[PDB]
Amino acid sequence: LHVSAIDLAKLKKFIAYCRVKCGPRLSAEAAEKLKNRYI
Amino acid sequence: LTDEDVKMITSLSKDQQIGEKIFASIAPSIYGHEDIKRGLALALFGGEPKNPGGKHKVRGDINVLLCGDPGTAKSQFLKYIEKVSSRAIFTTGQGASAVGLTAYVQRHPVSREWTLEAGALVLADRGVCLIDEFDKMNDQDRTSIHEAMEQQSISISKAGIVTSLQARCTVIAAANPIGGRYDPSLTFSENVDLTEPIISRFDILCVVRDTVDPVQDEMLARFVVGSHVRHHPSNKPLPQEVLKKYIIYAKERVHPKLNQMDQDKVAKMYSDLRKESMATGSIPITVRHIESMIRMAEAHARIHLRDYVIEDDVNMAIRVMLESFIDTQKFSVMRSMRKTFARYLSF
Numbered sequence: 309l310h311v312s313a314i315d316l317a318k319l320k321k322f323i324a325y326c327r328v329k330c331g332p333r334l335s336a337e338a339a340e341k342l343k344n345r346y347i
Numbered sequence: 348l349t350d351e352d353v354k355m356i357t358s359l360s361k362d363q364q365i366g367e368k369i370f371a372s373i374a375p376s377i378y379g380h381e382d383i384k385r386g387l388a389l390a391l392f393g394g395e396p397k398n399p400g401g402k403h404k405v406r407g408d409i410n411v412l413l414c415g416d417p418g419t420a421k422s423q424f425l426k427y428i429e430k431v432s433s434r435a436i437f438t439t440g441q442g443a444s445a446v447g448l449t450a451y452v453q454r455h456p457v458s459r460e461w462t463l464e465a466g467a468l469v470l471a472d473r474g475v476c477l478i479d480e481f482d483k484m485n486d487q488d489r490t491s492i493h494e495a496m497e498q499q500s501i502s503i504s505k506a507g508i509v510t511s512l513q514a515r516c517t518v519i520a521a522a523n524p525i526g527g528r529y530d531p532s533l534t535f536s537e538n539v540d541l542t543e544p545i546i547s548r549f550d551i552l553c554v555v556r557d558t559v560d561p562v563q564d565e566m567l568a569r570f571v572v573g574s575h576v577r578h579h580p581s582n583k584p585l586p587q588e589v590l591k592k593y594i595i596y597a598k599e600r601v602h603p604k605l606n607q608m609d610q611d612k613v614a615k616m617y618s619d620l621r622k623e624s625m626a627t628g629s630i631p632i633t634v635r636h637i638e639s640m641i642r643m644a645e646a647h648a649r650i651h652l653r654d655y656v657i658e659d660d661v662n663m664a665i666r667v668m669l670e671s672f673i674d675t676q677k678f679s680v681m682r683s684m685r686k687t688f689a690r691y692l693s694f
């Protein structure tokens with residue numbers, strides 16, 4: 309690092325983009341698997 | 348700023364004893380503490396700041412803490428640094444400070460205009476804040492100095508001023524250990540009242556013990572009385588401003604680069620040091636220390652006015668960093684590390 313010294317702006321923009329655009333909300337099969345591994 | 352400065356500084360830089368000439372030109376009104384003269388030289392000239400990408404804050408400022416039992420020229424050192432280094436200010440943990448560590452906005456009295464009095468560090472943004480009696484600063488100043496040397500930006504949010512003034516401080520500090528006397532049995536951290544994260548990031552820790560000794564006390568007393576008789580009102584190394592022109596020249600114009608050091612040697616160095624330090628109650632050398640080692644290397648290359656760091660510079664930076672680490676370490680482990688690593692401290 310000392311000698312050498314996607315992109316940051318692109319990544320933060322992409323972060324805001326995902327957060328504003330999509331609402332992820334799991335499916336029932338995933339919920340049941342999580343139930344089993346939760347117990 | 349001036350011209351012929353390049354001529355004089357390079358002409359003397361040819362000499363190649365310039366490192367020791369600087370070490371003996373720093374702090375001539377003090378006796379002994381050659382380790383701290385050298386260490387403050389490395390702090391004064393600093394390293395380099397870099398940012399691989401826009402993602403990693405690696406700094407060029409070498410921060411120093413003297414910890415000393417009383418009456419051993421800590422404030423004398425600090426006032427020398429204030430005198431010599433441009434963009435220096437002084438401040439104290441106590442309330443008698445000329446300039447304060449915290450940032451505040453008010454109506455400044457002598458002008459009665461509503462200033463943003465940004466604190467001591469920000470006012471010393473390029474160069475040095477000097478914290479005398481670093482061991483008693485109020486908890487607000489603890490918060491502020493911690494956030495300064497960690498973030499390197501002071502985040503003010505008082506009235507409506509929700510801003511962040513950048514503070515690229517190069518903090519020097521002085522601290523009196525608990526009980527007014529250094530205790531070699533306990534470690535540095537637990538015999539100085541500075542908490543772990545604060546004591547960590549200081550690039551140099553130095554210990555100042557006032558060990559009674561015949562020849563030492565004779566020398567010190569003769570020096571002091573000589574100064575006194577010389578400073579009666581009847582009698583009314585390089586010069587300091589020469590050193591200051593050297594300081595700015597080698598601090599801004601010269602950026603020594605590093606592809607010319609035994610990468611494998613230093614990697615195995617960290618390996619061996621940490622491998623020995625593997626133990627309980629033995630908080631080891633880490634990457635903090637290895638980057639401090641590179642900072643010190645760059646600083647010695649700066650000090651030599653070179654444009655390329657050399658094995659000689661790497662040896663000196665190794666020497667000072669390892670000296671600081673062992674003297675941080677308590678007595679028995681200190682002697683173990685000193686005995687097994689004398690080869691580097693030999694140089």
Ligand SMILES: Nc1ncnc2c1ncn2[C@@H]1O[C@H](COP(=O)(O)OP(=O)(O)OP(=O)(O)O)[C@@H](O)[C@H]1O
Pocket residue numbers: 376377378379415416417418419420421422423424523567571
């Ligand atoms: N090595 C030394 N060389 C010259 N003077 C010294 C030395 N050690 C101590 N003194 C003298 O000791 C007196 C006290 O110095 P200084 O102001 O540094 O105190 P201190 O040890 O930092 O104490 P405190 O914790 O109260 O700040 C000064 O006169 C200083 O000249």
Ligand SMILES: [Mg+2]
Pocket residue numbers: 421422423479480521
């Ligand atoms: Mg003092």
